[PDB]
Design an enzyme around this catalytic site. Structure first.
Site, PDB file in Angstrom:
ATOM      1  N   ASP A  43      -3.915  -5.136  35.307  1.00  0.00           N
ATOM      2  CA  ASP A  43      -3.982  -3.957  36.172  1.00  0.00           C
ATOM      3  C   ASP A  43      -5.359  -3.949  36.818  1.00  0.00           C
ATOM      4  O   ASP A  43      -6.277  -4.603  36.320  1.00  0.00           O
ATOM      5  CB  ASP A  43      -3.760  -2.640  35.417  1.00  0.00           C
ATOM      6  CG  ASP A  43      -3.429  -1.481  36.344  1.00  0.00           C
ATOM      7  OD1 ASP A  43      -3.331  -1.705  37.569  1.00  0.00           O
ATOM      8  OD2 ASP A  43      -3.282  -0.345  35.851  1.00  0.00           O
TER       9      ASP A  43
ATOM     10  N   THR B 111      -4.695   0.329  41.882  1.00  0.00           N
ATOM     11  CA  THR B 111      -6.026   0.064  41.376  1.00  0.00           C
ATOM     12  C   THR B 111      -6.483  -1.354  41.670  1.00  0.00           C
ATOM     13  O   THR B 111      -7.657  -1.553  41.996  1.00  0.00           O
ATOM     14  CB  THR B 111      -6.080   0.322  39.869  1.00  0.00           C
ATOM     15  OG1 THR B 111      -5.049  -0.434  39.220  1.00  0.00           O
ATOM     16  CG2 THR B 111      -5.896   1.801  39.577  1.00  0.00           C
ATOM     17  N   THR B 112      -5.585  -2.335  41.594  1.00  0.00           N
ATOM     18  CA  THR B 112      -5.938  -3.677  42.041  1.00  0.00           C
ATOM     19  C   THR B 112      -5.908  -3.778  43.560  1.00  0.00           C
ATOM     20  O   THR B 112      -6.463  -4.722  44.132  1.00  0.00           O
ATOM     21  CB  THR B 112      -5.012  -4.714  41.404  1.00  0.00           C
ATOM     22  OG1 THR B 112      -5.422  -6.030  41.796  1.00  0.00           O
ATOM     23  CG2 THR B 112      -3.586  -4.495  41.825  1.00  0.00           C
TER      24      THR B 112
ATOM     25  N   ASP C  25       3.466   1.014  34.509  1.00  0.00           N
ATOM     26  CA  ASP C  25       3.091   1.098  35.912  1.00  0.00           C
ATOM     27  C   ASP C  25       4.294   1.072  36.841  1.00  0.00           C
ATOM     28  O   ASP C  25       4.177   1.507  37.991  1.00  0.00           O
ATOM     29  CB  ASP C  25       2.142  -0.043  36.279  1.00  0.00           C
ATOM     30  CG  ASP C  25       0.780   0.109  35.638  1.00  0.00           C
ATOM     31  OD1 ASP C  25       0.373   1.259  35.375  1.00  0.00           O
ATOM     32  OD2 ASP C  25       0.113  -0.920  35.401  1.00  0.00           O
TER      33      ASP C  25
END
Lengths: 514, 73, 510, 509
Positions: free
Chosen positions: A48, A81-82, A382
């Protein structure tokens, strides 16, 4: 130690390069897997944008702040987030060149602002109000899982994902605080994953087939001791007075037969027959001579139950905890519609579905009980947090670079703030947008220049949101591929990038203190 | 955990086994150039055959231990 | 790394080279670990004890690495070993040379995902043609010869020199008795080394074999209830006390009188409760013994940790030391209790026979345990090789003749497709090739002499190498038509699990 | 053992390198300072008080920079970021040209005459503000709430803060000098919401009394503040041992209540329903009042009961045996204890000795309370300087460049040796006009030039630099304003520091 005029800015931007560079192949299906053995000295499989930050033993202060900033994004979005890591070092790259030409960071920061709200103006322009139909929910859940795991594993999981979020629409909830229980099944293949509407109990009642099929379950989620520990004390533990400790022994054996007789009065109190079932979930082990006697009465009595299951069974099914089995009405207990004892592995795993209130839906994955089972755990996590945003918004957008070049066309060509001071920051802002489609396709083999000239023309030709096919390297239209992003997700990555870019840009000294 | 492989491992086993064969080469004969063996015992130990001396050696080569164990067999 | 952050053990050189280099070195000892072996591996342990073995699962658990790519694959080799028998030698050596070929595609400039998906297309197409390469089946598992025909390859994968006598003897020790219709003992097949009576005098003893010497007379009935105890009987010696050497010897005599009447009642209460055999994981008391002869109860002088836990499983007993007069909570299961002299040693023999609840235990007799504990490793994967959980095991060519049979198909399939996955399908057929190239270098000839022939023979299924002259110069050995067989299932997982491990370890750069 | 120019230059190099990163922290547009802890902790602030306390200083002159920042903090709390900026270039520019010529005393007296010329120039540039108009007070608070750039509900907290400080304007030293903010009290409330609250009379209490121990509500009866002697009599009129015996129980307890009921009869003369007692309070004394139909209160700190005495404008009695309405509870008085959230909050309004009103805030949480409070904390700083000086000076470089010129014609008039520190201080004033050009991002050489050109025509009366737009702007039009008092004491502190380290030529042990 102090950091002066050039060096304090330089360490910040150079660290943002290699942080972005190592975390390049982590977004989308081109995003490769990563392992940490340097975060805790253990074999760990992790993917992540936020979780990789939290595990690595980072000492650069910028990446520590981004781990705090992307945490606020990870609480809402999860993946993305990435996405935020890629655009930061690219944004810092263009503005540093102006500072390498010689320019204030603040006038570029001044140009970072009005460039942003035009893109924020563009987000309302480019948002596509689709329905929250299951197949539309599948396409969000496909691209979320294929980012983290394989596509063959994704599509099996995507079947289990999109049905639980339709169950939380029965509770009219746009967000996901429950129905998110990830249960893990002992297997050797993680190719299988079962969806249970109710709960999954992880135990099997030492003398089996007490009542393995319960059509009328009146649940009692308690922790009553029947194997009671018997101690003789005069000091709080074992003492030397042999005269004193002997008199307590005669009452210790009277407690075990006390709790056996209380089960019999409760079965006739609740059921009255054996046609209607009665289920006892004990958090502790039960006497097998009691498990023989309770089995004849029409009672299944599950033992050694997990303490995490103790609260969640009370929420959906019901049943409160006691240390007795006193005469209780079915109003005091909860209900389950169907109880079945399932077996896979060395433990029996009793399925309990169709609750008194189907409020929590258990996501039961199978797997070889490895970090692969851990890797499919946070991937579907996720996966659920992405489609959590789908129930939040009304506009599901073709992503994967479709908005990215579409913003940069309007930003560069049309000066929003035609005064030249802010358009400098627009040029760094619009060139920050290019990093996500151009390098993942360049990783796929079709390099970054063939990808950009294709998607800029086609979107300016069509207006249809052509994205990028991350498995060929060429732009294909994301509306039919099913690589989509939410209106909730794409705003925050624009939000979280800009605020954390400006403050580290506007430093001039990093001093050792404390 | 350590490991060594291949021919430079293997020849190292060979010459290790040669030196213990350099010792006992005529110990069935009555003759040679003597070794009284003192250990952390601190005590004087001679022999007439090699097999008693081979009981005194704490071998440091495990491949050479195998030639001991066959000879002790 | 440019900054204070980013703790990692992989990168541009280290992920491309050193992860594969670590998987190279673990696969370097397994170049000759499956099929015909001249290779042997001496190990001193974390116990620091001398052992030689040819099972990698014994070797790799002694091996330690900080490389997670090297660490992960040996778990997948266990996953094949948990499922099928031998072939856990194959999982590392197949995936090891597989990843070395992936470096060469990274030398050219291929994307990693092109290399990732390239073997995945090759993994699926090979699994399609693989049941078409089924050449036989175990049509009669009750037959000794059809069972021994499968077992000769897995014993050869430990040692070529003992493949034929043991494959008969295991079928003589009857893995044949299982219908395999959900019937396979995993601990009632547990190999029992009997020291002495050298290794060709290894024998057959059905039901639970206990090396421990039978003390007292035989059981009253063979239908006896089996009482399995952790330490019921004791033995007395002591030394100097808080004040040295206690003030009298009268209480020493007073403690000794009740000790005899304690163990008098212990053998009595077992005789009263119905159990006619006691299992002592502790030592035997003399005062307990001479009442046990009159009570006609059989005694075991001592037992280890493994002896009680098999009895608590098979008979169904509970192991606890009885400082009380013992009662039956153990429920004796075996209806036949024998004493046999195996290796001229008093051997406790428990026995019962059921359709899908039978017991049949391997026993070995050899003059050296350090030889015989490696011979049982040839037996360990061979018994689990019978666990295909099917009667007809869909027998494929043994030895590795299926590999060149597959490699003809895959590089032909790799030529037909387009892409950059196109090359890794062709390199996947090269991954079948590396194992007989590494075996022929233990046979005594070069690889190109051998591998030219096995491609030139045709789709045949039979043509392979052993460790003979026929392996060396013609490179033609009937490793299908001379009692050399392998099953479909062991071949299916070992290709599958080596693929999923190698695809997994290739993506990582951290 | 340290001496000479090396102490002097070490005073320069320390005081300069402090003000370097902190002048980037200046402006509503600023640059955050980064502080890496050796544990990896990160500090991203602009406020120099959090900066100076966190950083490690080894030069005691740099420790003295904290001390003059402690000086500005204890008097104001604001401008502590700014006092260290001006003091750097005073000793950076003038000193090395003149301490190679070595005249310390002349530069001290030059620093003396730099102070008072700035004072008269403050009266030249500052027009008076209205202390009787909220909107004249409003835009200056709006200049302060945008420093942290928080105007969620700080904009309505502008009127709450000005209706506190203007009301509590009462402070005497013989000529009524008012610079008080401790007479005001904020309300710290988790319940309710900010906007439907307003300032209430008296001084409102939240610090200890959070419960309806006084009454539920009070319209007529007065408040009673007791520092008087309420310690009961053990003997007849004697202090014997207290009750620990049945024999001590029967005799003493008759005289224990006898001291209390005489005091209670003195208090009922003014007819209260609420009595709070702080010094001499006994357990029996506050529960015969329960029998005297007055709920009595203790366990309150002394600073509460200075506020409570200012909540009613009365004198806390030290006379136990006679109490009056003209002693405690001046006028009728009002006491209101109502439910805000779940807790019953005591308000004491109707302050005789009038004009006493304090802050009532209530966030929907304590976090929602605390964020608006810090803006109102800065807002009550400003109005206190409005009470201190009712003239408003323009912000930006309008104040600085105007004073920077007046030293130059003072240097041409006096034209001694001191003329050279005047032009040095004249450039030392311009650093905050300098650093705003980095706080916006413009060409600093052109904007300082044109700000001199606007002094040639407009005298920089309200046309100073903005670090927000990078142009020389009307401070009347843009509303960037501040009182004269906060400008003077900021400059007065920087004068004190420059004279201080000029005396420092030796640092010995």
């Amino acid at each position: 130690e102090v950091a002066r005029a050039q060096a304090a800015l330089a360490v910040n931007i150079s660290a943002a390069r290699g942080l972005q560079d190592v975390l390049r192949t982590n977004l989308g299906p081109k995003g490769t897997m990563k392992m940490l053995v340097s975060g805790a000295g253990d074999i760990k499989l992790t993917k992540d944008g936020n979780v990789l930050l939290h595990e690595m033993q980072i000492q650069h202060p910028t990446a520590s702040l981004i781990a705090k900033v992307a945490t606020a994004q990870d609480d809402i979005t999860g993946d993305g987030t990435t996405s935020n890591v890629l655009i930061i070092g690219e944004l810092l790259k263009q503005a540093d060149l102006y500072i390498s030409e010689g320019l204030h960071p603040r006038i570029i920061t001044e140009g970072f602002e009005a460039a942003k709200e035009k893109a924020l103006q563009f987000l309302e322009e480019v948002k596509v109000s689709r329905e929250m139909d299951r197949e539309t929910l599948i396409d969000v859940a496909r691209t979320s899982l294929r980012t983290k795991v394989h596509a063959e594993l994704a599509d099996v999981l995507t079947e289990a994902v999109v049905d639980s979020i339709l169950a939380i629409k029965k509770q009219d909830e746009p967000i996901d605080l429950f129905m998110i229980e990830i249960m893990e099944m002992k297997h050797k293949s993680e190719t299988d994953t079962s969806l249970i509407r109710g709960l999954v109990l992880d135990h099997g009642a030492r003398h089996p087939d007490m009542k393995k099929r319960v059509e009328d379950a009146y649940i009692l989620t308690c922790n009553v001791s029947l194997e009671y520990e018997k101690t003789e004390v005069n000091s709080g533990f074992f003492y030397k007075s042999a005269e004193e400790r002997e008199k307590l022994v005669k009452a210790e054996r009277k407690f075990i037969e006390d709790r056996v007789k209380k089960i019999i009065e409760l079965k006739r109190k609740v059921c009255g027959d054996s046609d209607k079932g009665f289920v006892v979930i004990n958090q502790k082990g039960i006497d097998p001579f009691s498990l023989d006697a309770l089995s004849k009465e029409g009672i299944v009595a599950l033992r050694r139950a997990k303490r995490r299951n103790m609260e969640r069974l009370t929420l959906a099914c019901g049943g409160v905890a006691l240390n007795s089995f006193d005469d209780l009405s079915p109003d005091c207990l909860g209900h389950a519609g169907l109880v079945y004892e399932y077996t896979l592995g060395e433990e029996k795993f009793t399925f309990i579905e169709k609750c008194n209130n189907p409020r929590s839906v258990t996501l039961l994955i199978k797997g070889p009980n490895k970090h692969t089972l851990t890797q499919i755990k946070d991937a579907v996590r996720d996966g659920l947090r992405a489609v959590k945003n789908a129930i939040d918004d009304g506009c599901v957008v073709p992503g994967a670079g479709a908005v990215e070049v579409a913003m940069a066309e309007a930003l560069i060509k049309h000066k929003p703030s035609v005064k030249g001071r802010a358009q400098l920051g627009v040029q760094a802002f619009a060139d920050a947008l290019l990093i996500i489609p151009k390098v993942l396709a360049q990783n796929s083999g079709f390099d970054l220049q063939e990808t950009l000239v294709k998607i800029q023309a086609e979107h300016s030709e069509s207006g249809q949101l052509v994205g990028v096919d991350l498995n060929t390297g060429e732009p294909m239209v994301a509306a039919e591929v099913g690589v989509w992003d939410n209106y909730c997700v794409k705003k925050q990555l624009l939000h979280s990038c800009t605020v954390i870019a400006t403050n580290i840009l506007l430093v001039d000294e990093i001093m050792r203190a404390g | 955990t350590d490991s060594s492989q291949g021919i430079p491992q293997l020849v190292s086993n060979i010459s290790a086994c040669q030196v213990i064969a350099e010792a006992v080469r005529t110990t069935l004969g009555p003759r040679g150039m003597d070794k009284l063996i003192v250990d952390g015992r601190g005590k004087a130990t001679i022999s007439n055959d090699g097999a008693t001396i081979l009981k005194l050696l704490d071998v440091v080569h495990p491949a050479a231990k195998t030639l001991v164990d066959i000879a002790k067999s | 790394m440019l900054k204070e952050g980013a703790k990692h053990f992989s990168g541009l050189e280290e992920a491309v080279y050193r992860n594969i280099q670590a998987c190279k070195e673990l696969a370097q000892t397994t170049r000759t670990a499956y099929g015909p072996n001249g290779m042997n591996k001496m190990v001193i342990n974390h116990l620091e004890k001398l052992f030689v073995t040819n099972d990698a699962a014994t070797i790799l658990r002694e091996l330690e690495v900080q490389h997670p790519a090297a660490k992960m694959i040996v778990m997948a080799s266990h996953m094949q070993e948990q499922e099928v028998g031998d072939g856990t030698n194959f999982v590392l050596v197949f995936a090891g040379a597989l990843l070395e070929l992936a470096e060469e595609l990274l030398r050219i400039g291929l994307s990693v995902s092109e290399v990732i998906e390239g073997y995945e297309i090759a993994c699926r197409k090979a699994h399609e043609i693989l049941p078409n390469l089924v050449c036989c089946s175990a049509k009669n598992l009750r037959d000794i010869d059809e069972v021994s025909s499968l077992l000769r390859t897995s014993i050869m994968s430990k040692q070529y020199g003992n493949e034929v006598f043991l494959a008969k003897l295991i079928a003589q020790a009857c893995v044949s008795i299982f219908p395999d219709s959900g019937h396979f003992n995993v601990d009632n097949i547990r190999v029992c080394k009997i020291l002495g009576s050298g290794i060709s005098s290894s024998s057959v003893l059905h039901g639970m074999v206990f090396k421990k010497e039978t003390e007292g007379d035989v059981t009253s009935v063979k239908d006896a209830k089996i009482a399995v105890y952790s330490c019921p009987f004791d033995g007395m010696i002591t030394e100097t006390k808080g004040t040295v050497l206690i003030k009298t010897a009268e209480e020493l005599m007073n403690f000794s009188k009740g000790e005899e009447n304690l163990m008098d009642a212990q053998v009595k209460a077992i005789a009263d409760t119905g159990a006619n055999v006691v299992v002592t994981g502790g030592k035997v008391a003399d005062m307990a013994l001479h009442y046990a002869n009159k009570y006609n109860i059989m005694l075991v002088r001592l037992n280890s940790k493994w002896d009680l836990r098999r009895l608590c499983k098979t008979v169904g007993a509970t192991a606890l030391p009885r400082l009380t007069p013992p009662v039956l909570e153990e429920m004796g299961h075996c209806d036949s209790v024998y004493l046999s002299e195996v290796g001229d040693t008093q051997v406790v023999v428990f026995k019962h026979e059921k359709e899908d609840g039978a017991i049949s235990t391997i026993v070995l007799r050899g003059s050296t345990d350090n030889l015989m504990d490696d011979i049982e490793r040839a037996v360990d994967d061979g018994v689990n090789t019978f666990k295909v959980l099917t009667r007809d095991k869909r027998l494929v060519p043994g030895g590795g003749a299926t590999e060149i049979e597959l490699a003809k198909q895959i590089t032909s399939y790799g030529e037909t497709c387009p892409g950059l996955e196109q090359y890794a399908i062709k390199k996947f057929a090269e991954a079948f090739e590396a194992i007989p190239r590494a075996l022929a270098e233990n046979s005594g000839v070069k690889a190109n002499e051998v591998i030219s022939k096995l491609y030139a023979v045709h789709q045949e299924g039979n043509k392979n190498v052993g460790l003979d002259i026929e392996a060396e110069v013609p490179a033609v050995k009937d490793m299908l038509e001379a009692g050399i067989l392998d099953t479909y299932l062991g071949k299916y997982w070992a290709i599958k699990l080596a693929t999923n491990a190698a695809v997994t370890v290739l993506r990582v750069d951290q | 053992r340290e001496s000479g120019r090396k102490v002097q230059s070490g005073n320069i190099n320390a005081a300069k390198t402090i003000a370097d990163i902190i002048r980037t922290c200046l402006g509503p547009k600023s640059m955050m300072k980064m502080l890496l802890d050796p544990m990896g902790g990160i500090v991203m602030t602009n406020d120099g008080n959090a900066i100076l306390r966190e950083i490690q200083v080894q030069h005691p002159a740099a420790k003295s920079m904290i001390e003059i920042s402690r000086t500005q903090d204890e008097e104001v709390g604001d401008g502590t970021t700014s006092v260290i900026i001006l003091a750097g270039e005073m000793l950076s520019v003038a000193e090395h040209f003149l301490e190679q010529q070595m005249h310390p005393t002349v530069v001290i007296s030059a620093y003396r005459k730099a102070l008072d010329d700035m004072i008269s120039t403050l009266k030249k540039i500052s027009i008076p503000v209205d202390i009787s108009d909220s909107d004249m007070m409003l835009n200056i608070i709006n200049s302060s709430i945008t420093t942290k750039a928080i105007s969620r509900w700080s904009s309505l907290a502008c009127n709450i803060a000005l209706d506190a400080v203007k009301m509590v304007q009462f402070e005497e030293n013989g000529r009524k000098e008012i610079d008080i903010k401790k007479y005001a009290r904020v309300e710290k409330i988790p319940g309710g919401i900010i906007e439907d609250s307003c300032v209430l009379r008296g001084v409102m209490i939240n610090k200890d009394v959070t419960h309806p121990r006084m009454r539920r509500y009070i319209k007529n009866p007065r408040i009673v503040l007791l520092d008087s002697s309420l310690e009961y009599k053990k003997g007849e009129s004697q202090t014997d041992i207290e009750i620990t015996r049945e024999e001590d129980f029967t005799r003493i307890l008759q005289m224990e209540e006898e001291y209390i009921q005489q005091l209670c009869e003195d208090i009922i003369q003014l007819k209260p329903d609420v009595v709070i007692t702080e010094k001499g309070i006994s357990d029996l004394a506050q529960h015969y009042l329960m029998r005297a139909n007055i709920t009595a209160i203790r366990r309150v700190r002394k600073t509460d009961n200075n506020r409570i005495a200012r909540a009613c404008g009365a004198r806390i009695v030290s006379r136990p045996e006679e109490l009056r309405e003209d002693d405690v509870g001046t006028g009728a008085g009002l006491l209101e204890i109502k439910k805000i959230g779940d807790e019953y909050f005591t308000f004491i309004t109707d302050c005789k000795d009038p004009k006493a009103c304090t802050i009532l805030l209530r966030g929907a949480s304590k976090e929602i309370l605390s964020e608006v409070e810090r803006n109102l904390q800065d807002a009550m700083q400003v109005c206190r300087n409005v009470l201190l000086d009712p003239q408003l000076v323009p912000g930006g470089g309008a104040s600085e460049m105007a004073v920077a010129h007046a030293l130059t014609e003072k240097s041409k008039a006096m034209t001694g040796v001191e003329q050279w520190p005047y032009r040095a201080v004249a450039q030392a004033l311009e650093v905050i006009p300098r650093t705003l050009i980095q706080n916006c991002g413009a060409s600093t050489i052109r904007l300082l030039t044109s700000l001199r050109a606007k002094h040639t025509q407009e005298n920089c009366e309200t046309w100073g630099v903005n670090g927000e737009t990078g142009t020389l702007v009307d401070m009347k039009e843009l509303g960037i304003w501040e009182p004269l008092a906060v400008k003077l004491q900021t400059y007065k502190t920087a004068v004190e520091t420059a004279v201080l380290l000029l005396r420092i030529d030796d640092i010995v042990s």
